[PDB]
Amino acid sequence: RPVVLSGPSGAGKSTLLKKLFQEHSSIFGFSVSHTTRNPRPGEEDGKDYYFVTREMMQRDIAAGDFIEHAEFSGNLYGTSKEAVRAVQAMNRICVLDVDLQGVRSIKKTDLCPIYIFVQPPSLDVLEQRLRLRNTETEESLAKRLAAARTDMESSKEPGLFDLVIINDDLDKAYATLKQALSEEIKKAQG
Ligand SMILES: Nc1ncnc2c1ncn2[C@@H]1O[C@H](COP(=O)(O)OP(=O)(O)O)[C@@H](O)[C@H]1O
Ligand SMILES: Nc1nc2c(ncn2[C@@H]2O[C@H](COP(=O)(O)O)[C@@H](O)[C@H]2O)c(=O)[nH]1
Ligand SMILES: [K+]
């Protein structure tokens, strides 16, 4: 059963997932999404995302290559069918990191995952960590924080998410994440 992690920008998803993959790369495979945004230092094409142009993406979207796509804070993102098929082909549990539109779209597909919402202690803390990571422009930060307020609604929409994890203390959040996935982990014999 695949895993979908969602939550506001700055919540701690990449951080939690980096910990999950370093401990369980034998069991999990990451879905590499396509995006039009520019790489951040340390990000790697084909690893964090497939960094492409809006033009190609729109072309591939129309060609039917994507499971879902969404505009987020000025940029286009999407889960191509191939990024998920590749993981499943290697017999690994596919893990996706997407926004709320992505979650709503995936609910209408046959991926059938467990949905987890990563929530910051509060918006103030979220803003402080996001600003500190210092990877977004002020305009980008404004859009992300606006989206965060708006989307935090969802962690509560009845039946939407299977679980909500508060990323206050990181070790604690990570233990919570692994417990949620303990079955998949144990079954895979990891
Ligand atoms: N529990 C935590 N406490 C303090 N800082 C954290 C914690 N978890 C992550 N961070 C830091 O907060 C920033 C946002 O986390 P990140 O995982 O990149 O969020 P996301 O991928 O959800 O946008 C990063 O600089 C990260 O190192
Ligand atoms: N719907 C959707 N959202 C995505 C996808 N890839 C990344 N995102 C999301 O878009 C936001 C911005 O991610 P970032 O620019 O910080 O890497 C996050 O909420 C993230 O989950 C994707 O393929 N589909
Ligand atoms: K992603």
Side-chain angles (χ1 to χ4, degrees), residues 1-153 155 157-185 187-188 190:
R1 198 179 203 201
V3 177
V4 169
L5 254 198
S6 189
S9 169
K13 305 176 300 284
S14 309
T15 299
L16 281 161
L17 290 187
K18 185 174 186 181
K19 289 174 75 66
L20 185 68
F21 297 142
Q22 80 158 322
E23 168 168 30
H24 300 289
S25 49
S26 301
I27 306 179
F28 297 103
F30 180 56
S31 173
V32 178
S33 289
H34 280 75
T35 191
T36 58
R37 86 159 161 66
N38 197 243
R40 295 169 182 159
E43 288 196 314
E44 186 178 311
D45 188 55
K47 195 233 168 195
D48 303 86
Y49 284 101
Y50 283 114
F51 295 101
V52 299
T53 69
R54 178 177 292 276
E55 291 78 9
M56 303 183 263
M57 272 219 266
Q58 292 174 332
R59 243 125 58 198
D60 295 342
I61 284 175
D65 295 349
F66 284 78
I67 300 181
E68 63 71 48
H69 55 99
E71 186 78 15
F72 184 89
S73 291
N75 289 107
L76 180 58
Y77 299 77
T79 297
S80 61
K81 290 167 175 176
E82 286 296 316
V84 167
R85 298 166 157 176
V87 176
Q88 303 188 312
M90 308 175 272
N91 300 318
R92 292 199 164 164
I93 291 179
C94 192
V95 180
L96 308 275
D97 167 358
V98 300
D99 83 314
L100 215 67
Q101 295 168 87
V103 166
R104 294 197 154 97
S105 302
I106 288 167
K107 286 273 187 179
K108 306 188 202 74
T109 67
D110 69 359
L111 194 281
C112 304
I114 174 171
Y115 301 87
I116 304 177
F117 190 86
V118 177
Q119 174 183 292
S122 66
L123 282 299
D124 296 318
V125 169
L126 178 75
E127 174 170 359
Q128 194 264 314
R129 297 178 182 175
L130 195 57
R131 289 188 159 284
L132 192 65
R133 187 178 73 192
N134 190 40
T135 46
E136 279 56 60
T137 58
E138 266 286 343
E139 178 64 26
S140 193
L141 285 177
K143 282 167 184 162
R144 287 158 185 270
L145 277 330
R149 250 183 178 298
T150 298
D151 304 345
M152 286 271 269
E153 43 136 84
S155 73
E157 180 180 307
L160 191 58
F161 289 98
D162 289 292
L163 171 77
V164 173
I165 304 182
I166 302 180
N167 181 32
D168 188 37
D169 169 76
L170 177 60
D171 287 331
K172 181 182 171 181
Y174 182 62
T176 289
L177 170 62
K178 284 196 301 185
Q179 182 183 55
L181 305 176
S182 63
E183 239 41 59
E184 256 90 67
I185 291 180
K187 291 194 299 176

